[PDB]
C-alpha cells in the first residue's frame, strides 16, 4: 500500500508528478491544492498530509513537512524516492529588518544554517542555496500580482525560541552562541527567521533536486517576539503561480 | 485565551500538573492517557495533541512532540511555561546492537547529540544526560513488569536516513561525517537510534528540568503489539514514582 | 596618498565619475581586455595586483578592477571599491569544471559557493551562505542567452588553494591533507560544477554588507577529461565569458 | 611488568575487577587501609597502586594524577589488566550557592572541557557515568546520611583559566572561558573538577563502568582558592561502600 | 616557455637557485634584486613578478606573492616545483604592541593562523612555525644591518580590514569573531598583523621546505589604523642560508 | 605556602627565575644533583620541587606530572612564585625512521593535540617555543656534540589512541586519530609527547619563555612500546646560558 516508510504513498498516487509544494502545516495542504485543478486527498500520516492536484494538465503534489528540519528531511527524501524533483516551500515568518513589514512576501535566495539536519547532507561550507529557476518563478509570480516583495537571505533555526533569540521564555536565557545574534543577522542583511529552509535547501542543492522558498511575514521582530489568513492566501497565490511556471 | 503560541493551552488547563509524558505521535496520546484516571482531551494543534489525566490524585499531561528536536523543543518549552517540570519520553525504536532483541526495553542515560536544537540550549561539550530520578523510576518500573531492560547511550539523529547511515535512499549517498558512523557507535556501546532525545535531554538538563526516556525495541538493524504496550506501562508506572 | 581615497587601489571618487558597478576579474592583465568591450575605456591606476579602468556602458560610468588571486586580495579590492561608491560587483573568471558533461567553452553562472576559503569567515560565520545577488544572477543568465552560450547554473567550490584544496596531486609534496582527500568526488556527487578561488569571499562579503554580487566563469579545463585544450585555454572561452559579464552589466545600471 | 606506566602484572591484581581511582598518590594507601589485607603493589611517577580486599574480593586503589591525560593512562593500563569498573573519588569546588563545603557530589555526566575525551569519542558523545555505579554511590551516600547532590559536573583541563580564576600571574582568561562559570551556574552545573570528562567518556565508549563521587572543599561563589578532614572522610566512606555493592 | 601554470618560469630560468626571497608587491621585486649581483628579469604574470640574481656566486630568486595566502600558496608551490627549498618572506606590517615603533623590524617565530589556505596543508592544530635556521639567519642579519628588532608571534589575517579589527571601513563594523580581537592578541604578546605568513609558514613546515619571515613596521595600531632595513636584512639573511 | 598545589613560598626560590621542568617527580632529585647546592623544597601530588645553583645563581627543578592539566598547574604556580623561563625536559617516541633511541629532539613548535592549550589561546595561536630558549638548547646540544634533531612535535592528551597505538584494551582508535601518525610523519613531525603544546602555548601567550627538549626512548615506525642522559646534560647547559 506504500512505496515509502512514512508518507503512506506509492508512485502511482503521484500520477507522474515531479513538483511538490511543501507547506509546514498539514491543515494548509487542502487550501493550497484547492487553488489548482482536480484536487484530491492522498494520505495523512503523522505531520505528513498529502494532496494531488493538476496545473495545465500536469500533476502536482502538495505535502506538509511539519515543524523542523528532521520531519522536513523525511518528507523531501520520500517524495524524491517517489519522483519529485522540484520542491516549493511556502511558510510563515518573523521579519528582523525594520523595513520588512507584516504582510510582505519574502523569497529566499539562500539560508543561514542554524539547523542540524543540513549537516547530514553536506558540510557547513556548502551553501543552503535555492534553485535559480524556482527563485525566478517565485519572484516573477510575486511581481505579477503586485505583492510587496523582498529577495534575500533567511536565517533558518532549529528552535522557535533561543535560536531566534527570544527571551520571553521559561529560563529567560539564551545560550552564548545566540546571545546578540539577531542584531548580527540584522546587520548582515538577513531578512527573517523560519525553521525549515536550511534543511530543505541544503538537501536539494547537494542531491540534484530543485528547491525554492516563499513566505508571508506575520510578525516584525524589531517590534515584538510573538505574533498577534490574508497574508497566507497572498503567498499561497504566489507559490501556485510559481509552480505553474515550473511544470 | 491561550497562554502559549503553539500548544493552544492555558495554565488552568493543566490543573496543577507538573509532569508530562511526551510521545512523538499525536495518535498515541489518548492511548497513554487512557491508562490513567479521568482522561480528557485539552487541545490539538499541528503535531501537538495534549490530554490531561489523573494518577494517584494528581494531574498529569500527555502531549505529543512530533518528529525531531525542533518540534520537541517547542512542546517542552511551552509546557515548561505552563508549569511542567518533569518530562518522560516514550517511544518505539530499532536497535544497532546484536544482543538487543525485539521486545526488550531501553532506558537512556544520555544521548549522542547528532541534532541541531540541543546546541541552542548548551554548547556541544554539555552532556545530553537524563535526570537521575527519572531514569531510576524507568528502570525500576521496567524491572517491576519483568521486562528485559538495557540501560545506556542512545544516538539521537536529526535525520531518519543519512544520520542513521541509511543508503537505501534517493541519492544512495551518506555525507563524510556519517560514512561508517553506525559501526563506530556500535563499537562505543550505543544501543539505538532515535530522533528527539538529544534535544529533550539537553534542554531539560541545562534549564533545571527533569527528563527521562524509555523505548520499546520493535526492530533490529543487525538482525509487536506487546512491546508498545510494555513500554507504555513502564512510562506510566515511572510517572507514579516521580509525582 | 598621492591623490587616493583608499589605501591600496590608488583611486578617488572622482575617478569613478558616478560609477556604481564594477567588473572584477582576477588577472590585472585582463582589465584592459574587459574595458575594451565598452565605451571610451581609460586606465585609472595600477598598484600591486590592482589594475583599474573606467569605461562607459550605455552612457553610464563603469569600473573594471582586478582582484588578484584569492579571497584576501579580493576583499581589499571590493572593500575599497565600496568605500569609493560601488554597490554592484560582477566577477568574471576562468574555471576548471568537475562534472563530466560540462564541456570546455561552457559558461558557468554561480548561485552560491562552497566556502573553502578563510576570508569569508572575516565577514560572516560559516553558517551564512556565500550566495549571489538575485538581480546579478538574473542579468548573467539572461546575457548568456543573448550571447548564445552553453550555460550551466549552480554551485561552485571556492578554494583558498589551486592545488591541495582542489585535490591536485601533481605537486611538490604529492600529498593532500585529510580534509581534502577524496573531496573532489564528494563535491561532484553534490552537484558542484567547478573550482575557482575568489567567489566565496566576494559573495559572502557582499551579501553580508548590502552589496550586490554576481559570478560568471568560462570553462578552460575539465578535471574529468583527458584532453587539455591548447595554451589559449583561456583566450576564446574567456572572450565568450567576458562578453556575457559586460552584457549582464548593462541590465544592472 | 605487563603495563608500561603502572608497573603491574595481571597476577598483582589477584583477579580484581574494580578499581577506586583517587587523584593523589598519597591518598591511595589511606583508602586501601579502610579495606581488608591492604598491600602495596607499585609506585611509578604519579601512579601509586595498592591491592585490598572487600568482602573476600580483591579491589585496586590506583592514583590517576591531575587531569585527563594521566587519568587515561591509568584507566587503560588497568583495563588491560582486567579492571572493568572504575570509581573516582576526588576533591571539588562547588559553583552553586546552595552546595556547602563538606557536601558530597555524585556526577551523572560531565561538561567536556578537556581534550583527552575527544581521543575516545567525538564531542557529541556524552561523558555519562554508568547507571549501576551512580546508583551505588547515591545509595551509599544515603546509608551514611551525607548531604548529597546529584547532577552535572564541569570537567576542565585547567585549574585556573578553565575554571575562570582571575587571581593568576596573567590575570587573563581567554574569550572561550570569559563569563563561563556564570553560564555553567545557570545551566545547573554543580561543580568543577579535572578528570571526570576523560574518565566517563573513555569508559562509556569502551564498555567499562565508571562512577564519580567528590567532596566539596570550596564554594566558588565565595572564593577562588580553598582554605577540613570532615569533607574527605564522608566522600571516601561513600566510594568504599559503593564498591561493596558493585563487586 | 613555462614549466609551471602561473609564474611563467622554466627550471632552467632559476640557474640552480634553491632559495627565493618572496615579497608581496611585484613592483618591489626589481628593487630587492638590484641589491644583489647580476640581476636579471625573468617573468611578470598576474601578481607574480620574478627576477634572478647572484649572491656570493650563487643563484637566488626574488618573486612576488601578491597579497594573501592563496596567491602566496601558488608562488611557493610552483617555485618549489622548480627546485626552491628555502623561502624568505619580506613584507610590511602593522604593530599591535605599544613598545614597537614605526621603522622597527619584526622577525616571526610563528603565526596565529587567521587564514584559510594554511588549512589546505595542515589542520589547525599544526603550528605555523618558521624554520629555525631561517629565523636565526634573519635575527643575525638584523644585528649585522643595525635595526631595532623584535622577535615573536605574528597574527596572519585573510583580510586587511575586519580580521585586523579595522573600523575605517564601509560598514564600520566587525564580525563577532574579530570584535575585540586586536587587544586579545595584544594581551597574548602578539607583535603584529600581516597577511601571508600563516599560509607560508604552515605549507613550508608541513612539506619539508624552509621558511623565514621578516617585516618592517609601517604603522602602530595602538596609535592609528591608517599608515629599507627589512630589505637589507632579508638579503643578508639569504647570504647565510646558501 | 604562597600557592595551592606546589607547597612553596617565594623564599624557597632564593630569587630563581628559571625552572627546569621534567615530567617524573622521581627524576627531580637526579637533575638537581647535577648542579651545585641541591636542596629539596617540597613534594605534593606529582609535584616534587628541588632548588639548585648554576654559576652561582639559583635554579628550580620541578616535576609536571604527565599531561597538560598538571603541567599547567606547575607552570602557573611557578610563575606566581617568580619563574619567567621554563625549560621542559621530557621523554618521547620518535615517528621518523632515522631518529635513534637516545637522540635529542629540540621542539620549535607543537601540534596541539591537547585540550589545556585552548584554555590560554584559541587553536589558531601557535604552540611555539621561545627563540632564546630554543637557541640555548640547540647551541648546548652542539657543545656536547649529541645527535640532535630540531623541528615540530605532536603533543597529545593521550598516550594510546591520540598517538595511534592499537595494542590496547579496545584495539580501536577514534576516527580523528585513525591514520594520524602517517599524516604527522609526512608533515615532517619528529615525535610524540604529552606536555609541550600546553607548556608552549600558555607561556607564549602570557609573556613567559619556554624551551622544550626530549630524549627518544622508542621508535614508533618499529614498535608501540619500548623493550626497556644527553638530553639532560643539554637542558642543564642550556639553563646556564639563560640566567
Ligand atoms: C583551470 C583553473 C583555474 N582556476 C582554478 O581555481 N582552478 C582551476 O582548475
Ligand atoms: C580538582 C579540583 C579541586 N578544586 C577545585 O576548585 N577545582 C578542581 O578542579
Ligand atoms: C601588509 C600589511 C601592512 N600593514 C597592515 O597594517 N596590515 C597588513 O596586513
Ligand atoms: C611521554 C611519551 C613517551 N613515549 C611515547 O611514545 N609517547 C609519549 O608521549
Amino acid at each position: 500500500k506504500s512505496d515509502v516508510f512514512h508518507l503512506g504513498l506509492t508512485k502511482n498516487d503521484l500520477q507522474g508528478a515531479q513538483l511538490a509544494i511543501v507547506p509546514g502545516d498539514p491543515e494548509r495542504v487542502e487550501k493550497i491544492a484547492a487553488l489548482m485543478d482536480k484536487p484530491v486527498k492522498l494520505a495523512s500520516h503523522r505531520e505528513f498530509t498529502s494532496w494531488r492536484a493538476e496545473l495545465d494538465g500536469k500533476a502536482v503534489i502538495v505535502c506538509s513537512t511539519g515543524i523542523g528540519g528532521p520531519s522536513t528531511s523525511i518528507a523531501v527524501e520520500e517524495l524524491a524516492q517517489l519522483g519529485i524533483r522540484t520542491f516549493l516551500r511556502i511558510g510563515t515568518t518573523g521579519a528582523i529588518q525594520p523595513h520588512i513589514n507584516v504582510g510582505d512576501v519574502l523569497v529566499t535566495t539562500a539560508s543561514v544554517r542554524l539547523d542540524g539536519a543540513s549537516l547530514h547532507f553536506a558540510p557547513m561550507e556548502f551553501p543552503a542555496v535555492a534553485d535559480f529557476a524556482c527563485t525566478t518563478a517565485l519572484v516573477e509570480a510575486a511581481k505579477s500580482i503586485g505583492a510587496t516583495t523582498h529577495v534575500g537571505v533567511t536565517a533558518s533555526s532549529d528552535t522557535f525560541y533561543p535560536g531566534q533569540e527570544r527571551y520571553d521564555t521559561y529560563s529567560g536565557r539564551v545560550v552564548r552562541r545566540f546571545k546578540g545574534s539577531m542584531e548580527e543577522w540584522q546587520a548582515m542583511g538577513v531578512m527573517n527567521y523560519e525553521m525549515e529552509s536550511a534543511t530543505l535547501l541544503t538537501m536539494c542543492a547537494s542531491q540534484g533536486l530543485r528547491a525554492g522558498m516563499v513566505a508571508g511575514v506575520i510578525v516584525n521582530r524589531t517590534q515584538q517576539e510573538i505574533p498577534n489568513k490574508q497574508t497566507e492566501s497572498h503567498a499561497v497565490k504566489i507559490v501556485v503561480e510559481a509552480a505553474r511556471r515550473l511544470l
Side-chain angles (χ1 to χ4, degrees), chain A:
Chain A
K1 272 188 79 283
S2 180
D3 292 330
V4 289
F5 191 83
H6 296 90
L7 306 184
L9 296 170
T10 62
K11 286 187 179 184
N12 200 45
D13 296 329
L14 269 64
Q15 302 196 358
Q18 291 183 297
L19 189 148
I21 292 96
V22 282
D25 198 331
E27 290 113 68
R28 216 228 254 104
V29 177
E30 175 171 9
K31 299 172 186 170
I32 299 162
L35 288 171
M36 302 180 282
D37 301 316
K38 298 169 186 69
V40 73
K41 165 76 175 303
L42 294 179
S44 172
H45 303 279
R46 306 290 294 269
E47 51 263 61
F48 314 113
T49 294
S50 56
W51 276 60
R52 195 195 65 252
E54 195 185 71
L55 282 176
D56 304 324
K58 291 97 184 174
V60 172
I61 293 295
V62 195
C63 186
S64 61
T65 61
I67 291 166
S71 61
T72 302
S73 74
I74 290 166
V76 177
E77 165 60 36
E78 296 189 6
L79 289 168
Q81 284 186 34
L82 295 165
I84 290 99
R85 300 292 173 261
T86 300
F87 297 85
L88 296 183
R89 182 171 137 70
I90 174 81
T92 56
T93 190
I96 64 168
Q97 295 298 325
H99 304 288
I100 298 173
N101 314 311
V102 169
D104 288 4
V105 172
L106 306 183
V107 178
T108 303
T109 55
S111 298
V112 188
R113 294 169 60 178
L114 309 174
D115 71 319
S118 59
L119 291 159
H120 294 218
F121 296 96
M124 195 58 85
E125 313 88 271
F126 198 94
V129 58
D131 172 79
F132 175 74
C134 293
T135 310
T136 298
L138 290 164
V139 172
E140 289 180 349
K143 291 180 178 179
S144 73
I145 68 102
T148 304
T149 312
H150 313 267
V151 190
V153 181
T154 296
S156 190
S157 179
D158 263 1
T159 57
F160 188 85
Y161 295 97
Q164 303 189 25
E165 212 188 348
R166 295 192 221 269
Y167 287 96
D168 300 0
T169 55
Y170 173 71
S171 63
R173 77 156 178 91
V174 167
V175 74
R176 186 192 285 239
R177 177 185 170 192
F178 290 108
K179 195 180 280 84
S181 64
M182 182 170 68
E183 190 276 328
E184 285 158 355
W185 306 137
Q186 281 198 212
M188 292 180 193
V190 181
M191 302 186 299
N192 64 312
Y193 280 122
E194 54 78 72
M195 295 180 64
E196 293 82 22
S197 67
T199 300
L200 170 72
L201 297 179
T202 308
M203 73 182 292
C204 286
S206 65
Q207 290 182 124
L209 304 162
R210 307 192 305 172
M213 245 272 292
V214 64
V217 181
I218 60 158
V219 71
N220 187 298
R221 291 290 312 278
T222 72
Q223 290 175 202
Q224 58 198 128
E225 291 196 353
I226 293 299
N228 308 301
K229 282 176 166 65
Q230 192 71 23
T231 306
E232 195 179 57
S233 55
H234 211 142
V236 174
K237 204 194 293 175
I238 301 316
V239 77
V240 171
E241 175 66 23
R244 202 186 295 274
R245 301 168 190 257
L246 294 162
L247 299 168

